[PDB]
Amino acid sequence: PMTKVLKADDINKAVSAFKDPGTFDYKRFFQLVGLKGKSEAQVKEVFEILDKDQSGFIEEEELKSVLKGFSAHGRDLSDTETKALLAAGDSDHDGKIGADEFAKMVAQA
Ligand SMILES: [Ca+2]
């Protein structure tokens, strides 16, 4: 699970910090969860967990389930939160997040 690269206590704190619907901010979430400061190889492990269907990209519906990839009991994002998250990282405008795009989201957070 995500604990292969992140700490169980950081996951719990970061997910709880965004329990309120509509409040997700990936930048603060990446800080709280301890993903900021991870090497490219460890970021790739996070990406692969979020890419549930092995497509090589995090599609929009996989982004909506981002919190569940960190913690199984996390809530889904709203469509508004998902669209904002996608817009923050989808630099080629294809509607999904690739590996390099995701690494850049971690770097810019
Ligand atoms: Ca996918």
Ligand SMILES: [Ca+2]
């Ligand atoms: Ca893209």
